């Protein structure tokens, strides 16, 4: 099976994934998979609030199990290995009314540049 | 060596109402490191903290310690890192492998008040 999810939206509130550069179109994360991702997170005014690239530390998590914000748990499984995409996440799929203290204001839409570098032991 | 979660009573609650897993709790807290430095306090913001307890939304030491408090109780919760933030710590706030000392006041259980 092969596919490229060039645009994907789930919800208006919700999450949008826009493919920027294709992955291999074959390997997609499933629930419970461990993913390795490089990301940069920005607010809608363009200001950066975090970046794994800036600290040269790829981020790893189990996907689809509620360990990350909902926009990532829903959006990352729509990426294939090696894909670069942009995730736009409304507050309902992010940090909601409170935001994240010290980093993200309440009621913030989030824009993540994400690169899927790994799915379990598969590497881009 | 040894690790774990210890609760020391400072002022008793009503001794009758205890949070069950899945209950909402309303709590005032101050968190300190073992060197005495304060890293956070709901009291300083004068904003009670609310969470659902026993469902993994907070560190293990709170999920384990708070259900042993009765309504209105003031206690000190000491939490070794394996029941807190572990080797990772919390970025910008809690060093890796930190024991945590929380002053905890159980202000409410669901809609119950003292
Ligand atoms: C206990 C510490 C542990 C930290 C790490 C393992 C290091 C890791 C690199 C986080 C960053 O450390 C510099 C840093 O990254 C952010 O800047 C970010 O860019 C983001 O938003 N990320 C990050 C990338 C994925 C999407 C999104 C996210 O889901 O992060 C999760 C998160 C904060 C989830 C909350 C948990 C409570 C819950 O109520 C809430 O529900 C809405 C969701 C992180 C990975 C936690 O699972 C683990 C940690 O927190 C956010 C703002 C703060 C975060 O720092 C703490
Ligand atoms: C999505 C944002 C959301 C924030 C709030 C709702 C505001 C609330 C007032 C937190 C403070 O905001 C000023 C502030 O409080 C601390 O200072 C603290 O004093 C502590 O330690 N607390 C806090 C008191 C209970 C015990 C302990 C704790 O469990 O907090 C949880 C926590 C951080 C759990 C992580 C989640 C990822 C997971 O991987 C990790 O596993 C080890 C545990 C908080 C309440 C999350 O449920 C929700 C938020 O994070 C910690 C250091 C950081 C925290 O700020 C973000």
Residue numbers in the entry:
A (entry chain A): 15 to 25, 29 to 141
B (entry chain B): 28 to 141
Show me the paper's own sentences about this structure:
Calcineurin is an essential virulence factor that is conserved across human fungal pathogens, including Cryptococcus neoformans, Aspergillus fumigatus, and Candida albicans. Calcineurin is a serine-threonine specific protein phosphatase that is a heterodimer consisting of a catalytic subunit, CnA, and a regulatory subunit, CnB, and is activated in the presence of calcium and calmodulin. FK506 acts on fungal cells by binding to FK506 binding protein 12 (FKBP12) and forming a complex that binds to and inhibits calcineurin by sterically blocking substrate access to the active site. FKBP12 is a member of a larger family of proteins called immunophilins that bind to immunosuppressive molecules and mediate their activity.
Here, we report the first crystal structure of a fungal FKBP12 bound to FK520 that was instrumental in the design of FK520-based analogs. FK520 (ascomycin) is a natural FK506 analog that is modified at the C-21 position with an ethyl group replacing the C-21 allyl group in FK506 (27). A. fumigatus was selected for FKBP12 structure analysis due to the readiness with which protein crystals form and the presence of key conserved fungal residues in the 80s loop. The A. fumigatus FKBP12-FK520 structure clearly shows that both the C-22 and C-21 residues of FK520 approach the Phe88 residue. This proximity and potential for a steric clash suggested that modifications at the C-22 position on both FK506 and FK520 could introduce a high degree of selectivity.
